[PDB]
Design a protein around this ligand. Structure first.
Ligand SMILES: *[C@@H]1O[C@H](CO)[C@@H](O)[C@H](O)[C@H]1NC(C)=O
Ligand SMILES: *[C@@H]1O[C@H](CO)[C@@H](O)[C@H](O)[C@H]1NC(C)=O
Ligand SMILES: *[C@@H]1O[C@H](CO)[C@@H](O)[C@H](O)[C@H]1NC(C)=O
Ligand SMILES: *[C@@H]1O[C@H](CO)[C@@H](O)[C@H](O)[C@H]1NC(C)=O
Ligand SMILES: *[C@@H]1O[C@H](CO)[C@@H](O)[C@H](O)[C@H]1NC(C)=O
Ligand SMILES: *[C@@H]1O[C@H](CO)[C@@H](O)[C@H](O)[C@H]1NC(C)=O
Ligand SMILES: [Ca+2]
Ligand SMILES: [Ca+2]
Lengths: 177, 536, 535, 177
């Protein structure tokens, strides 16, 4: 576990907003984060596009199963760790690689589940805008502990602990020390 | 002094040629350094690979041979730049040592941080051109940017395809991508920055630039793009029926086996000059051998691809000239009057028949595009019909596609800068009524006026031309350095701020002797071509 | 003084009313002198006849009664002038003594021999009267004799069936009878029976353009000033008289299968019973109006004037900047302009009502949606209300006026084109608006030089008075010599109003900054005259 | 009887040009003139419209028969006196009245010839500009005595003697008496 952040009652949200002229658009996505919580319904990280574009990426725990759902333009594609239980209070890490429609999701050292959609799928996540951690405004606030958020060469928590000018924190998001 | 720079495959010797002008420093030229294996034998009609390391030092001083082509043939004159068509005899001097092995590039290096790189994608059409024609030793010295001009497979040997797996096609685009990869992984030794690689080009070469944006092959190779007088959504940008022309060439060359693999294998045996001299004529306002939609380089047709945001947010600079279809009116350009009504009707009817050709309705489209492109305040002027015909061709082929691609790029939050060149050097043989034609912006970008008239540009150059050239390359080099044509280097050009191209507010900048930032370039006619003609 | 002037039928008395301004001479007004026998009984629905001589003397001092009409009814509110519909309560005062015997005229003689200017009133063919316009300021200023008449309107004046039972066009015949009375009776009043000008605004202007193409009016007049009106627009003539007359006959109480029987039954009914009946025509059309029969209007006015069936009259045609101000009436209650959903609905209804061709109702709609929209302000809203107003003005008033000016100038007749732009700042009229339909009548009649009346309560500055003087001088010069700038010279002193040649359609941009322009809305006029017929 | 103009060898022409802004268009026309000649083929008078418009009116003697031919917009209507020989050297007169498309031709005391062309015919003579006496431009010269040209209240021959500015005489035309 890297820079651990603790979420308490009520929760909160931490937002990393890219500069307007340096917003990235990438074919492939790489997410990785460790966590420890007992919540049955929560959202860990939400990645949004700019105004108008409907491209999105979301990671959430529903009914005790962690999963990632993304909209790349054609339709929503979701991959979930169905044959497991994750809200048992123990620390578990999750990794996710994306290539167009193809999505590989792994948790702990268990075998990687793969999703290979059929038909023509768009492959471009257009004009990333903000990284949201907490999911409180979405509708399912997250309470627990998070660590080591890695996103395509951007360690969100590591630079957030450095108090960079492009990160804003609100709520019960506290730093473990 | 002959400086030696070690690349990743060996060491190359350059030169230190000096410039005539005073304010420009010395330039180092590594002319002719290879970037891929020669596609001579069984590697013909195959994608290029990495070069072969040479033990020792390679003398890189002489201009490399040009790719096989045929200038004195049946070239499509409508799409070629005006200065290339007018001075065809002078332009044929550069293409004199044509050989099948032509995969070489030339670097021009000057002498606030690490110097950027500007690759030039030449080619008025896909059958002609060579990187030796443009000397980028002036732009490199002025803007302190390493300028790289390449040579890639052209015409028959470069863009032949059948749709099957026997010959996928777009070997020229693969050669360009290989050159970009070589620059990315080898420019650090020459002093360039492998993270600020702009690519720019005019004419159909600019189309390649657009076709290099929607391709996933060139993902991280380059960062910016300056597409001037070119698009990937025009009529002569992509070849949609390669099989017909390939089979026609195969029949005219000697072997026309029914199975495509056997025909391709036979074609690989013919020497490079027999299958180029063949006269395969495409339909008017189209191309015979060019980029082909296959799935590897171009996944789908470029028009559909850019609608659904299939690009990776490249800083982009589009532009057009005032009247580029100067060769649309050439049969009626040496007359005392302009175009008669019986000739205007005939020209518009031929235009509709050649381009649209809709059996459902054409007696309505012809009349409405006839009414739209005529001045009713001077309906019987006669001379004011050449202008309207030239505007018609320019609007349909060059202005509307440029505006459409600028809007589609800006709709996904990517910096888009639109320019409209309006000045033209006074040519000896060009009509007085003619305005800035296709390819007349290339002399200014490469700084020809500050050096003097050449064989390719026999023009008078005054002080205004020198000032405009300096300003144009200042803008281009600022864009190459920082992606914003106003930030790094201070500049009626002093008090003009070039703004982005928003879809809602289509601000552009009007290059010329009277610069100004305007709000909509030919909104009426562009909206006619984009939003009304599709309804009819 | 109460001077008496002897006419060919008797002796009439008038008054010598004085004007408010101090630069105009006294004007002798003869109000209510008849010009035809009253069409009361069996003479109803018959052409008028010459009046009856009277013994002794007759004062003409009270305003004559107006023709029967239903002003508080379903009049066509699109073709009517804006000041008529705005001040409908004040305009109803004038038509208060309505009677069937309404054939009268009023002369305003000022104090070679002075010319005559007859005014043909009527925003539509079913309303208005000549008593509204006091042509006394124009008479004194221009030293011309202004005549304003009352002619039969509506059912009593334009009902027709197509056959010989009721040919129709009784209003035009009454106007021609008034012209004849002027021709053979104006020499006694000091007028010149050889310099008679005829002019009118609105539907009355259409009457002018139907009196030029009429064989009956050959030598009665020699000039014409048609402002904001045409005989080729959609609401100028009536091509389906039988349908609407049968609808009216069925509604009133007798619809005989024989046309003659129906006409004879109608002649036995009171005027107020069948005038008050509300027969609603199709949109942008009329129910009762001029009909092509063969006597008054021989053929279609659009076909008649293409073959040069007119007698070489000097013409002064004109339009206003925006006349379809009442086309956009439901969109004047919105802070913004019209929404994108409100711009493709009005255009669709416009195409359905006016063209209505199933074969090409989806191609024409798209092209006239594309033409009438500002692509530099595609999502402005206000510049969609402006473009809708421009569309209605271009189709109804500007294109027919330009077409008729071209047709008249092709056959070598003097045509002068004008485009009124200035407008008096009214009370309730929107600020964004411009000179609406019939907003030049106050200036032509010298309303600003006396003040705001009931019909025009608008505030008038010095610029309005100067413009009124300028336009009145132009009109009076045209009446005097057929050249707007020849007799009386007047940035208005150095502008030479040139002719309207077909090759270069020169005109005068009348307004606060007049200038002789070259082509008035060439693109849209050519769109309506050349491209739309090809679609 | 009145002012008579003679034609000498070669020929001659008398042209009346209307004022530029005073060209009349008439629905009905009158044309009366006295003539005496022996020429088998000739043209006496010819009334032309302005430039462009095709309306015209002419009076001509063919094969010894005098006749009036006019074009008012639809078709050429020619009505000719057939049962009479007029080129016997005597002094005759001819009158012609046109109304609508209907025409009436009368020579001396002979019965009138009336022509009612079939169908609905154009009527208006648009913008008369010139009147021509002699017709040397047409190709058939005139050699004889002409007097009393009456045209809608206009006496061209009378005004020619009084040296009217508009009237022009070109050729070998002489005035008698
Ligand atoms: C997804 O996987 C399929 C099958 O392995 C492959 O054909 C396709 O190219 C992959 N998509 C991407 C974007 O790599
Ligand atoms: C390069 O040129 C030098 C001098 O001409 C010569 O000595 C050397 O061998 C050359 N090298 C090659 C690879 O041609
Ligand atoms: C430069 O312009 C002059 C006219 O000012 C012209 O005569 C001359 O020919 C031009 N230069 C050349 C090299 O021709
Ligand atoms: C006309 O009116 C005046 C005033 O009302 C009156 O005195 C006069 O008698 C009237 N005329 C006749 C002929 O009665
Ligand atoms: C209209 O004119 C009157 C009289 O000059 C003036 O009092 C009034 O103020 C003017 N209009 C307005 C609204 O001021
Ligand atoms: C011509 O004659 C016919 C038959 O007599 C008549 O009906 C018609 O009215 C005449 N034309 C004119 C213009 O009077
Ligand atoms: Ca997308
Ligand atoms: Ca005619």
């Amino acid at each position: 576990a890297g820079t651990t952040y603790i979420f308490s009652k009520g929760g909160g949200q931490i937002t990393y907003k890219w500069p307007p002229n340096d917003r990235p658009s990438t074919r492939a996505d790489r997410l990785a984060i460790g966590f420890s919580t007992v919540q049955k319904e929560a959202v860990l990280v939400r990645v949004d596009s700019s105004s108008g574009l409907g491209d999105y990426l979301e990671l959430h725990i529903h009914q005790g199963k962690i999963g990632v759902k993304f909209n790349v333009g054609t339709d929503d594609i979701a991959i979930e760790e169905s044959n497991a239980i994750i809200n048992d209070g123990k620390y578990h890490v999750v990794r996710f690689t994306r290539s167009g429609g193809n999505a590989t999701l792994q948790v702990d050292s268990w075998p990687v589940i793969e999703r290979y959609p059929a038909g023509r799928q768009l492959t471009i996540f257009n004009s990333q805008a903000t990284i949201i951690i907490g999911g409180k405004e979405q509708g399912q606030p997250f309470q627990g502990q998070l660590s080591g958020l890695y996103y395509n060469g951007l360690k969100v928590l590591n630079m957030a602990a450095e108090n960079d000018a492009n990160i804003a924190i609100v709520g019960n998001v506290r730093l473990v020390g | 002094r002959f400086p030696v720079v070690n690349t990743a495959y060996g060491r190359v010797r350059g030169v230190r040629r000096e410039l005539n002008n005073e304010i420009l420093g010395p330039v180092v030229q590594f002319l002719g350094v290879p970037y891929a294996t020669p596609p001579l034998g069984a590697r013909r009609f195959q994608p290029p690979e990495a070069p072969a390391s040479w033990p020792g030092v390679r003398n890189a001083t002489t201009l490399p041979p040009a790719c096989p082509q045929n200038l004195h043939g049946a070239l499509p004159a409508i799409m070629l730049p005006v200065w290339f068509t007018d001075n065809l005899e002078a332009a044929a001097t550069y293409v004199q040592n044509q050989s099948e092995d032509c995969l070489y590039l030339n670097l021009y290096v000057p002498t606030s941080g690490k110097k950027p790189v500007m690759l030039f994608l030449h080619g008025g059409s896909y059958m002609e051109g060579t990187g030796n024609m443009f000397d980028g030793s002036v732009l490199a010295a002025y803007g302190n940017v390493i300028v790289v001009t390449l040579n890639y497979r052209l015409g028959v040997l470069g863009f032949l395809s059948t749709g099957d797996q026997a010959a996928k096609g777009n070997y020229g685009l693969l050669d360009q991508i290989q050159a970009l990869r070589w620059l990315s992984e080898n420019i650090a030794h020459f002093g360039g920055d492998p993270e600020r690689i702009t690519i720019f080009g005019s004419g159909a070469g600019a189309s390649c630039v657009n076709l290099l944006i929607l391709s996933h092959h060139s993902e991280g190779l380059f960062q910016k793009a300056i597409a001037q007088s070119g698009t990937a959504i025009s009529s002569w940008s992509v070849n949609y029926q390669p099989l017909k022309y390939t089979r026609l060439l195969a029949a005219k060359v000697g072997c026309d086996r029914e199975d495509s693999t056997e025909a391709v294998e036979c074609l690989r045996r013919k020497s490079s000059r027999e299958l180029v001299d063949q006269d395969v004529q495409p339909a008017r306002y189209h191309i015979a051998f060019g980029p082909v939609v296959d799935g590897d380089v171009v996944p789908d047709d470029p028009e559909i691809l850019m609608q659904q945001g299939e690009f990776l947010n490249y800083d982009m600079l589009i532009g057009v000239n005032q009247g580029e279809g100067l060769k649309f009116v050439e049969d009626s350009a040496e007359s005392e009057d302009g175009v008669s009504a019986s000739a205007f009707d005939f020209t518009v009817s031929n235009f509709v028949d050649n381009l649209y050709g809709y059996p459902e309705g054409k007696d309505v489209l012809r009349e409405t595009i006839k009414f739209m492109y005529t001045d009713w305040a001077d309906r019987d002027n006669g001379e004011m019909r050449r202008k309207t015909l030239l505007a018609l061709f320019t609007d349909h082929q060059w202005v509307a596609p440029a505006v459409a691609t600028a809007k589609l790029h800006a709709d996904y939050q990517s910096p888009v800068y639109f320019y409209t060149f309006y000045h033209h050097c006074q040519a000896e043989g060009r009509p007085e009524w003619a305005d800035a034609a296709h390819g007349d912006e290339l002399p200014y970008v490469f700084g020809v006026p500050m050096v003097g008239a050449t064989d390719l540009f026999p023009c008078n150059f005054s002080k205004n031309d020198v000032m405009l050239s300096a300003v144009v390359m200042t803008y281009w080099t600022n864009f190459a350095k920082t992606g914003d044509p106003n930030q790094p280097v201070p500049q009626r050009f002093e008090e003009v701020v070039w703004s982005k191209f928003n879809s809602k507010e289509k601000q552009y900048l009007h290059i010329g002797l009277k610069p100004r930032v305007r709000d909509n370039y030919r909104a009426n006619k562009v909206a006619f071509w984009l939003e009304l003609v599709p309804h009819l």
